[PDB]
RNA sequence: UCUGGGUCGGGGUUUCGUACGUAGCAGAGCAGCUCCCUCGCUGCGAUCUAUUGAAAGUCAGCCCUCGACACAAGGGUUUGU
RNA sequence: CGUUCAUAGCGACGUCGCUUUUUGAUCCUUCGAUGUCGGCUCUUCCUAUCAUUGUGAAGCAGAAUUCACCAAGCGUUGGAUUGUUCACCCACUAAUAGGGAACGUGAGCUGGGUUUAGACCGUCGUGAGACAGGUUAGUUUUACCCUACUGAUGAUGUGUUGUUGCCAUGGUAAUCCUGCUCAGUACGAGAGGAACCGCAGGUUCAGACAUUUGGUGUAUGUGCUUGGCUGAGGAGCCAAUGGGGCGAAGCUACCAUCUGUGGGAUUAUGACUGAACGCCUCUAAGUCAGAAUCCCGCCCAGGCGGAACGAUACGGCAGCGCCGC
RNA sequence: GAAUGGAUGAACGAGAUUCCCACUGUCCCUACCUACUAUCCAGCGAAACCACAGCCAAGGGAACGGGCUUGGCGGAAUCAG
RNA sequence: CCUCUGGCAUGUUGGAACAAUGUAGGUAAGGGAAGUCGGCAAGCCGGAUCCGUAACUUCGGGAUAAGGAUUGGCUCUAAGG
RNA sequence: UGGCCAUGGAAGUCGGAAUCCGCUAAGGAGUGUGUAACAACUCACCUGCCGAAUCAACUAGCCCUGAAAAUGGAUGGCGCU
RNA sequence: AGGGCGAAGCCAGAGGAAACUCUGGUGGAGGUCCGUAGCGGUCCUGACGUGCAAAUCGGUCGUCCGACCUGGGUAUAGGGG
């Protein structure tokens, strides 16, 4: 019901945040974000909570060479909450989902953002801790 | 050849010569549609920025994920004492326009407002309307004023009275207090005369015109910044590394053809000083100022409800480039227009406000008061005094 | 408006200012202000550092 | 002459992080002298504690002073229905 | 052809056109030189409309859709390979439409490619040498003139001066999307599966701003530290800003925050009354609804365009304003 | 395609490519700072270039006009770009 | 890089400002070559001591391969004539 | 009158050779709709009302559709019914 | 300049029945490596481009005991060197 509000989002394309779930990938080659129309020369760019598009660059080789939907779980840019705390993570950091927003994976290592707990149920319920 | 990849344009055209403003004080392009039902008021007002800070508050807008959750917001003080009508100036529709048709000043007129009318008053005699205050006793000349004002009964439509600031009240230097013309919105002309000539040389303050959780318009002139390249200005993209003759600029100005740089071309030039007209921007505050009974009325500005402190709006060591706001003011959300110091228009809007998010009653929880000269962590200096203890300097 | 201590310093922390780190341990800290948050980067133990609260608490300043 | 604006000073604010000096039974050890006492005394000795959130800067485009000091109708060129 | 049915969508055999974003013809212009490809950057136009608004069509149940109309307001992206144009692939998207401006744009760049001289290879040549065959190395000049544009002083007028004002004319701006709700509802055998009004936010664009977060930092602010140098201490300095922590103010970032509006005429279209044509017809006279259009509003600038009001040279020589003659 | 040398090849190369790690304002996306300029002033003081000149739309025209035709229009003298 | 001896007056001028463009330096949040014909440019690395050192090889090399750790100040000890 | 060819179904009706008589006031061995095929529907001859012209096929004048380009624009301009 | 690598020869010790082999030293080879002066001149396609300069400047670079650099003297002269 109530939509997301913007945040500061300092994941452009090119970036491989380390996958925080347990399917055996290490990392995110994020080689694009849903839901970007863009600009001319504009990197498009994922914060947290955002949905992108990933490669994985290192893991298991079942996931190699290929391309998987992804969250970015925590962002080491600092965002903005609306209550006025600026909110960094220490860093970048993501997980291997399905199209529908289910988790491929099954438990979160580390602390999820509620910016991507709220608007990401399935992931909020394999996170152990919250912002 | 067509442009390859395609991309919208830089800056708006709808804005520009892009000069440095004539005015200073920002000019009320218009005034709302006077109703000739609802009673008479004032539609402006002529404040001062002198700074911004935090607010903290609960916010109403059910939907949102921030429904009911404390919100922190930025706003603007902006240090409005109140103004001295001084005048009134009939208008006339004609098909050429609309015609000021007559000015009848007031008696008195104060030396903060007489100032305006010479570039040098050390050097002037200071013999404006001295002639003129000579009507306002005798026979004669009331009867001639009552002509007038009989005159803008019968023929005129607009009226605006004209007002000017209090620059005694202020801490900025200048004692040349501005002028301005204020319209009249509401009965009939007779009646909306009357009003303005019962008004004649009285004070009035800020809250007479507006009132809280009120969408206004801000109207004022841009903080200035000289000349400055295209980069700056229009915000082209910088050419790259490589470029041999400079790389803050635009590479193609225009086609051959049209054998002319048109005007919708980016060039370098003045940036800033503009004049801008930012509208709804939302009254959170109306502040008090101090004020005696028995001793200062420090409170009644920066406490609230929740807060029950001791605090002005002033912060630890005062605005900065500014004061002490020892006056009324009010405090909108968000930023607004030009400097610290600046005159500022403001005006009531010109739109029928009917939208959630503008007829939003504001509760404030906390006023931040901690200096902005530095990263300020106390909010009064008898908290500060507190935690830090005593020190050398006892 | 539930007012905050500095992870490092120990004043306050008013709604508006500073900033809160999440480290990947799963504990979070707050900040006054980016010289406390580059102390504690760094490193530095604010029990030695003067200014602090943990400090004069340490060298029973005051009292 | 709303006596004013200015310089200096004083507060406030704030930045940095605790000055010099002095004292110490603090100080890894070492030495000189002896009362060869090794807590003897005296010296060297990074650093430490205390004095000390000290010192220092803070409009030059921060805020208040009404404390001290002078200085404040002065000059030149103009323009007429 | 489309089960059936020439024309929902198509369309053979024939035929009539437009277009100059293809390539040819041609050689009128330029050989006392008009800088020869592409990319970058920037502005503007066109429509032969991909999306977006409003609509007619279907072989349109819904969803998805192709066909057509008004229409160019607003958009039309990120990459891998290639010097490329072109091409292709991945990804996102509402959509990844097509062009023009000396095949826009070298005193704007770049110079990867063509296209001197150095060299290699292949094929051809007795050979010097040749090759829209491959390769590698190879100088990218000048603006202070005039205009144009950008901003900046001014100009004639109004007796002089100041004021607060009006407004001729120019410019002009907002955009599209998601989620929730309607609703697993209409529609449908089911599978699937809408929409209007609301509500919450976001894209791109625009205009600001610095409370806060971040950036800068020679306040050369305050520590800390290298080498040297004032006999040492203390206090300092030098090393083109010695170096480094932290850093006020000030600039400043979708890297922080705020704001972005209302009408009118109508177009396509669908309608009314209604003849022409004893009926019927949106039309012929007459009337209605009607839009990302257009015109204005708001918004920016303000005319060899005006306005009301103020004060109008005590003087040491003054000089003027009215009035009447 | 074999001393018009063929195939090879450690070491070496301001030689020609391709990828990876690191690193970065190359970029997303630009920003702030410093010095010397440019700027204004005193003094000093060149050059290239120059038919006349210098606002546009369209027309025709040696088939892309500053000048011609028809329209739009036109306001001293200048400054930085 | 700083200093004495000796030598100079900043390289054919001065002053006031601190705009845009530059020339020469720096710094940048998050990402890290997504830029571009091409990592061009800048950045990383750098000294020493102690470990540790691959493929390949003409057995000489490769080799500072790579990859690691340490480094200051102070007060002592031992070892070298 | 399931007329005949066509069976895959065409008793008027995907198509094609046929293609007349009766009743007749008069209805084609059938214009279509639609059917597996019928059915059902729909398309002359005649009346009832109303009250003088009505209707078809060609043809050529003006006007209109056909009729899309990139700086803003040209029956020469203003304009003109 | 100053460093690095450490070739032959030489010493000792250990093994070997012999052949000879290992270990530690010493020794200081080389159109050897780094790197100054010197000589050069890669890239920035940087500065400059009516220049400081009719080819210069800055950083970055190649080489730096050898086919090394370099003064003076002397030889070769135009279809000739
Ligand atoms: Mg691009
Ligand atoms: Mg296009
Ligand atoms: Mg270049
Ligand atoms: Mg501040
Ligand atoms: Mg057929
Ligand atoms: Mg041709
Ligand atoms: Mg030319
Ligand atoms: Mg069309
Ligand atoms: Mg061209
Ligand atoms: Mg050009
Ligand atoms: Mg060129
Ligand atoms: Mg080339
Ligand atoms: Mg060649
Ligand atoms: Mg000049
Ligand atoms: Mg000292
Ligand atoms: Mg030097
Ligand atoms: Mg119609
Ligand atoms: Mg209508
Ligand atoms: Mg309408
Ligand atoms: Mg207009
Ligand atoms: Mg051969
Ligand atoms: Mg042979
Ligand atoms: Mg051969
Ligand atoms: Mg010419
Ligand atoms: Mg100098
Ligand atoms: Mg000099
Ligand atoms: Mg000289
Ligand atoms: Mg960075
Ligand atoms: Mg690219
Ligand atoms: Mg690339
Ligand atoms: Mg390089
Ligand atoms: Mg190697
Ligand atoms: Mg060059
Ligand atoms: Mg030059
Ligand atoms: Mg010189």
């Given at each position: 019901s109530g939509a997301k509000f913007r945040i500061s989002l300092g994941?452009?394309?090119?970036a491989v945040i380390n996958?925080?779930?347990?399917?055996?990938?290490?990392?995110?080659?994020?080689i694009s974000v849903k839901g970007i129309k863009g600009r001319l020369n504009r990197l498009p760019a994922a914060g947290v909570g955002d949905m992108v598009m990933a490669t994985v660059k290192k893991g298991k080789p079942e996931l190699r060479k290929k391309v998987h939907p992804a969250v970015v779980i925590r962002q080491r840019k600092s965002y903005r909450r609306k209550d006025g705390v600026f909110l960094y993570f220490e860093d970048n950091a993501g997980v291997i989902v399905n199209n529908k927003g289910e988790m491929k994976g099954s438990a979160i290592t580390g602390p999820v953002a509620k910016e991507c707990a709220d608007l990401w149920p399935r992931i909020a319920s394999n996170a152990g801790s919250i912002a | 050849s067509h442009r390859k990849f395609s991309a919208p344009r830089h800056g708006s055209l709808g804005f520009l010569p892009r000069k440095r403003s004539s005015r200073h004080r920002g000019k009320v392009k218009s005034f709302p549609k006077d109703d000739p039902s609802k009673p008479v008021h004032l539609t402006a007002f002529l404040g001062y920025k002198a700074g911004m800070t935090h607010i903290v508050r609960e916010v109403?807008?059910?939907?949102?994920?921030?429904?009911?959750k404390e919100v922190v917001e930025a706003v603007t003080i902006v240090e409005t004492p109140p103004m001295v009508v001084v005048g009134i100036v009939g208008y006339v529709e004609t098909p050429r326009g609309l015609r000021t048709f007559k000015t009848v000043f007031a008696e008195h007129i104060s030396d903060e407002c007489k100032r305006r009318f010479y570039k040098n008053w050390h050097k002037s005699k200071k013999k404006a309307f001295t002639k003129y205050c000579k009507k306002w006793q005798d026979d004669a000349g009331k009867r001639q004023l009552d002509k007038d004002f009989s005159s803008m009964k019968k023929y005129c439509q607009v009226i605006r009275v004209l007002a000017h600031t209090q620059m005694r009240l202020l801490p900025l230097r200048q004692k040349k207090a501005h002028l301005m013309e204020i319209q009249v919105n509401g009965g009939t002309v007779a009646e909306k005369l009357d009003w303005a000539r019962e008004r004649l040389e009285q004070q009035v303050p800020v809250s007479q015109v507006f009132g809280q959780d009120e969408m206004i318009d801000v109207i004022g002139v841009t903080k200035g910044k000289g000349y400055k390249g295209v980069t700056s200005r229009w915000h082209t993209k910088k050419l790259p590394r490589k470029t041999h003759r400079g790389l803050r600029k635009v590479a193609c100005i225009g086609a051959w053809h049209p054998a002319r740089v048109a005007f919708s071309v980016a060039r370098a030039g003045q940036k800033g000083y503009h004049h801008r007209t930012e509208i709804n921007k939302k009254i959170y505050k109306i502040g008090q100022g101090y004020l005696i009974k028995?001793?200062?009325?420090?409170?009644?500005?920066?406490?609230?409800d929740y807060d029950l402190?001791?605090?002005?709006?002033?912060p630890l060591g005062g605005f900065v480039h500014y004061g002490e706001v020892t006056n009324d003011f009010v405090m909108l959300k968000g930023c607004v227009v030009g400097t610290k110091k600046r005159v500022l228009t403001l005006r009531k809007s010109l739109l029928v406000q009917t939208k959630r998010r503008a007829l939003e009653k504001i509760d404030l929880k906390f006023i931040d008061t901690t200096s902005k000269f530095g990263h300020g962590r106390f909010q009064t200096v008898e908290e500060k005094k507190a935690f830090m203890g005593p020190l050398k300097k006892d | 408006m539930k007012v905050e201590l500095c992870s490092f310093s120990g004043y306050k922390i008013y709604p508006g200012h500073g900033r809160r780190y999440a480290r990947t341990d799963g504990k979070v800290f707050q900040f006054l202000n980016a010289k406390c948050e580059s102390a504690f980067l760094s490193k530095?133990?604010?029990?030695?550092?003067?200014?602090?609260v943990l400090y004069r608490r340490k060298h029973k300043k005051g009292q």
């Open positions: 994941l452009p394309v090119g996958c925080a779930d347990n399917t055996g990938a290490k990392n995110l080659y994020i | 109403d807008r059910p939907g949102s994920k921030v429904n009911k028995d001793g200062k009325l420090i409170k009644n500005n920066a406490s609230t402190s001791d605090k002005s709006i002033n | 530095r133990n604010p029990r030695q550092i003067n200014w602090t």
